[PDB]
């Protein structure tokens, strides 16, 4: 059963052919096999992308793969309207309700946006690319208005070869007028190289910057050369390693042959690649489906051209995109789950950051849920003296540890940052300041919390005597002070 | 009512106004936060508290 | 200072729900200069807002 | 000292050998660090222009 597909490469589009023969290869299976037929092309013009669309129509398809881009979108999206021919992608979402077209790249501006107000962020700017779209833009535009930033985007995309370097220094020296520390990069891989080459080259990744390269893979572009500046960089994956699905394949991937698979053996793959083989396991996942329903959309008829008067469809296509809408399998990015649209849901996008050490793991996202802090103290016992601690007016109105204020709750909440703890006030309420008892030598009040270790620091007017030496160590004297008399 | 002394002076300067600090200090002793044997946070503490 | 906000995608039967919705959250920072980019079509539909 | 970033504003180097424009420079030229240097070669000259 050799089913006959489409295919439309970008020229230059190395590493996505050879991850598309992997799938080819490997799932393949006994009982069906799927014919690929690919084309090469430039993927921006929509001539280009319009005959060799008819032409593989005129040779008639069950689906295409292919990519599209920008300046091509809607006459991929129309084409499929019309002909009802399906269109598995893993370009960037087209925004609206789309029939026949399959997007196999995740959405990113929830995540992208849930990631802002976790930095707590209100003024950054944000450094956007036109060659996908501004749907992007569009969303941090609306979210700026009721959120309270202040959002200074500027495009680059139309940058020439040959002006390069004297144009990103007149980005960067206007951001420093503005005094910007925080800034978005919203691009593809060789745009971030470019603009991280121009960031090292004046010298603006030290401590105090910080980066969101806003795109599905953060370490697919080159890292190293950030890796050690003191700006903290984070980022967007969804091919996570630590699978043993995704190891699977790297180990496979890895061993591979330069000239039979250009860009094979490496270590890493990346998120544009990686979707090209996650669809060879949907659009095989389809043909299993379709023929255990046992419907048989054999159309031998002949499709003739695309340029019909007037043009008709056939309602065995109908038939194709239900199959393709319900699949729900695992692949290197995780849960393959799509909606009426064509769009994907039930994802999950790993929230990394770039540690010296490389790149480390803070959390995932969801629909269901916003970014989940995926990681992986002191308790303080005291007692309320004025003016040292203090309990507030505001007793049941203000709520939290802010309950209680004095001199020594400043000096308390001083000593836990600094040193790095965060501090837990409470205060045994026997009174009694305590000491080594008579005859039984039981230390009472809040000594009895530390040394008895139910406590671990006391930030309290306590006083340092010879036997209270000894079972526990101190710090250094707040005040100098002695015994007055109070009349 | 023998007491610490700064504890004395803020009753003084609080308004019931009806307190005396007389004399002077009678002795020397000191505020230091308590940590257990060993601490977890103390060194830390020293120079954070210095 | 520059607030762009995305006018679009609004639809028919929303219409007076959601011009309401944008410019109480203008009056809650109190803008008080407008630019409209749009087609004749949509501008009389704001003008009437 | 780019890879760790130490060239920034705050940051004075001076390389101490007789070609200052000899080695590559470029890469410091926009940082923010002063570099100073010592050359005898001036291309200023006409001999040397010739």
């Given at each position: 059963?050799?089913?006959?597909?489409?295919?439309?490469?970008?020229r230059?589009?190395?590493?996505?052919?050879?991850?598309?023969?992997?799938?080819?290869?490997?799932?393949?299976?006994?009982?069906?096999?799927?014919?690929?037929?690919?084309?090469?092309?430039?993927?921006?013009?929509?001539?280009?992308?319009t005959?060799?669309?008819?032409?593989?129509?005129?040779?008639?398809?069950?689906?295409?793969?292919?990519?599209?881009?920008?300046?091509?979108?809607?006459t991929?999206?129309?084409?499929?309207?019309?002909?009802?021919?399906?269109?598995?992608?893993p370009?960037?979402?087209?925004?609206?309700?789309?029939?026949?077209?399959?997007?196999?790249?995740?959405?990113?501006?929830?995540?992208?946006?849930?990631?802002?107000?976790?930095?707590?962020?209100?003024?950054?700017?944000?450094?956007?690319?036109?060659?996908?779209?501004?749907?992007?833009?569009?969303?941090?535009?609306?979210?700026?208005a009721?959120?309270?930033?202040?959002?200074?985007?500027?495009?680059?995309?139309?940058?020439?070869?040959?002006?390069?370097?004297?144009?990103?220094?007149?980005?960067?020296?206007?951001?420093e007028?503005?005094?910007?520390?925080?800034?978005?990069?919203?691009?593809?891989?060789?745009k971030?190289?470019?603009?991280?080459?121009?960031?090292?080259?004046?010298?603006?990744?030290?401590?105090?910057?910080?980066?969101?390269?806003?795109?599905?893979?953060?370490?697919?572009?080159?890292?190293?050369?950030?890796?050690?500046?003191?700006?903290?960089?984070?980022?967007?994956?969804?091919?996570?390693?630590?699978?043993?699905?995704?190891?699977?394949?790297?180990?496979?991937?890895?061993?591979?042959?330069?000239?039979?698979?250009?860009?094979?053996?490496?270590?890493?793959?990346?998120?544009?690649?990686?979707?090209?083989?996650?669809?060879?396991?949907?659009?095989?996942?389809?043909?299993?489906?379709?023929?255990?329903?046992?419907?048989?959309?054999?159309?031998?008829?002949?499709?003739?051209?695309?340029?019909?008067?007037?043009?008709?469809?056939?309602?065995?296509?109908?038939?194709?995109?239900?199959?393709?809408?319900?699949?729900?399998?695992?692949?290197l990015?995780?849960?393959?789950?799509?909606?009426?649209?064509?769009?994907?849901?039930?994802?999950?996008?790993?929230?990394?950051?770039?540690?010296?050490?490389?790149?480390?793991?803070?959390?995932?996202?969801?629909?269901?849920?916003?970014?989940?802090?995926?990681?992986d103290?002191?308790?303080?016992?005291?007692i309320?003296?004025?003016?040292?601690?203090?309990?507030?007016?505001?007793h049941?109105?203000?709520?939290?540890?802010?309950?209680?204020?004095?001199?020594?709750?400043?000096?308390?909440?001083?000593?836990?940052?600094?040193?790095?703890?965060?501090?837990?006030?409470?205060?045994?309420?026997?009174?009694?300041?305590?000491?080594?008892?008579?005859?039984?030598?039981?230390?009472?009040?809040?000594?009895?919390?530390?040394?008895?270790?139910?406590?671990?620091?006391?930030?309290?007017?306590?006083?340092?005597?010879?036997?209270?030496?000894?079972?526990?160590?101190?710090?250094?004297?707040?005040?100098?002070?002695?015994?007055?008399?109070?009349? | 009512?023998?007491?610490?002394?700064?504890?004395?002076?803020?009753?003084?300067?609080?308004?019931?106004?009806?307190?005396?600090?007389?004399?002077?200090?009678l002795?020397?002793?000191?505020?230091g936060?308590?940590?257990?044997?060993?601490?977890?946070?103390?060194?830390?503490?020293?120079?954070?508290?210095?």
């Amino acid at each position: 059963n050799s089913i006959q597909i489409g295919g439309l490469f970008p020229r230059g589009a190395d590493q996505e052919y050879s991850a598309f023969r992997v799938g080819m290869v490997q799932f393949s299976t006994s009982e069906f096999r799927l014919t690929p037929h690919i084309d090469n092309l430039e993927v921006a013009n929509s001539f280009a992308v319009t005959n060799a669309f008819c032409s593989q129509f005129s040779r008639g398809v069950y689906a295409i793969f292919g990519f599209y881009d920008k300046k091509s979108v809607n006459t991929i999206t129309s084409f499929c309207g019309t002909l009802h021919v399906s269109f598995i992608t893993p370009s960037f979402p087209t925004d609206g309700t789309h029939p026949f077209v399959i997007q196999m790249r995740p959405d990113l501006k929830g995540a992208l946006l849930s990631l802002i107000e976790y930095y707590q962020w209100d003024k950054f700017a944000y450094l956007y690319d036109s060659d996908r779209g501004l749907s992007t833009l569009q969303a941090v535009l609306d979210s700026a208005a009721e959120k309270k930033w202040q959002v200074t985007a500027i495009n680059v995309g139309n940058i020439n070869n040959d002006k390069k370097d004297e144009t990103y220094r007149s980005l960067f020296q206007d951001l420093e007028l503005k005094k910007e520390r925080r800034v978005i990069l919203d691009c593809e891989r060789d745009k971030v190289n470019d603009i991280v080459d121009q960031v090292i080259t004046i010298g603006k990744h030290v401590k105090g910057y910080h980066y969101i390269i806003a795109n599905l893979g953060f370490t697919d572009g080159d890292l190293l050369k950030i890796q050690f500046g003191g700006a903290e960089v984070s980022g967007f994956q969804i091919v996570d390693y630590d699978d043993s699905l995704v190891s699977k394949f790297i180990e496979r991937w890895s061993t591979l042959e330069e000239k039979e698979y250009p860009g094979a053996h490496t270590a890493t793959i990346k998120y544009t690649s990686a979707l090209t083989y996650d669809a060879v396991q949907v659009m095989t996942e389809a043909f299993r489906n379709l023929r255990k329903q046992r419907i048989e959309i054999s159309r031998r008829g002949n499709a003739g051209d695309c340029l019909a008067n007037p043009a008709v469809p056939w309602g065995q296509g109908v038939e194709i995109e239900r199959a393709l809408k319900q699949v729900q399998v695992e692949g290197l990015s995780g849960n393959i789950k799509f909606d009426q649209n064509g769009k994907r849901i039930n994802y999950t996008i790993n929230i990394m950051e770039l540690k010296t050490n490389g790149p480390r793991k803070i959390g995932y996202w969801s629909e269901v849920d916003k970014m989940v802090l995926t990681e992986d103290t002191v308790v303080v016992t005291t007692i309320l003296e004025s003016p040292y601690v203090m309990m507030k007016k505001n007793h049941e109105m203000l709520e939290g540890n802010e309950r209680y204020e004095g001199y020594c709750v400043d000096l308390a909440a001083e000593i836990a940052k600094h040193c790095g703890f965060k501090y837990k006030l409470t205060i045994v309420g026997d009174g009694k300041y305590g000491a080594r008892d008579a005859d039984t030598k039981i230390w009472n009040g809040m000594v009895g919390e530390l040394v008895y270790g139910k406590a671990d620091i006391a930030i309290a007017p306590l006083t340092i005597t010879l036997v209270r030496e000894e079972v526990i160590d101190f710090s250094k004297p707040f005040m100098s002070l002695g015994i007055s008399i109070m009349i | 009512y023998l007491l610490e002394s700064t504890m004395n002076e803020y009753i003084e300067q609080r308004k019931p106004c009806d307190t005396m600090k007389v004399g002077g200090n009678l002795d020397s002793k000191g505020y230091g936060i308590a940590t257990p044997k060993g601490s977890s946070l103390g060194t830390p503490v020293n120079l954070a508290v210095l």
